[PDB]
Amino acid sequence: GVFAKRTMTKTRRRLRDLDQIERDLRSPRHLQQYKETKAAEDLPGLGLYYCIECAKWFESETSLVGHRKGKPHKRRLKQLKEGAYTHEEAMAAIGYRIDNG
């Protein structure tokens, strides 16, 4: 069940990308900038309960724990284990490379 499926693909309804989520998992600084672009008082649960893999805020720790048992979270985990598509892999697909000397 997706809320308002007609306008899911609009730019104003865009969700966070998987490579950005991978960078959030690798480096806490990048996650810190992403959380700086938000306001904690408007966040669900005052921004205390956050799943990095789903890039999602939850209203309580019980809600976050219950979300971890669902298949969307496991689908995100499987996608992250397979790896996110990046510009470097796009380069390697066509056999291009960067020459820095």
């Binding site: 008082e41 408007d42 966040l43 669900p44 805020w57 209203e59």
Partner: protein, 43 residues
Amino acid sequence: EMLARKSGRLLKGGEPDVDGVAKQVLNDFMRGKIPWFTPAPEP
């Protein structure tokens, strides 16, 4: 924000509705639901 989270006046994602809660508080102040008065000047 505390009044909004207590009374369940939440927007989408649980964001507190400070606008509606402020309107409720103003109406309660105006319509004799919160006690207040101007003390008289002393002679």
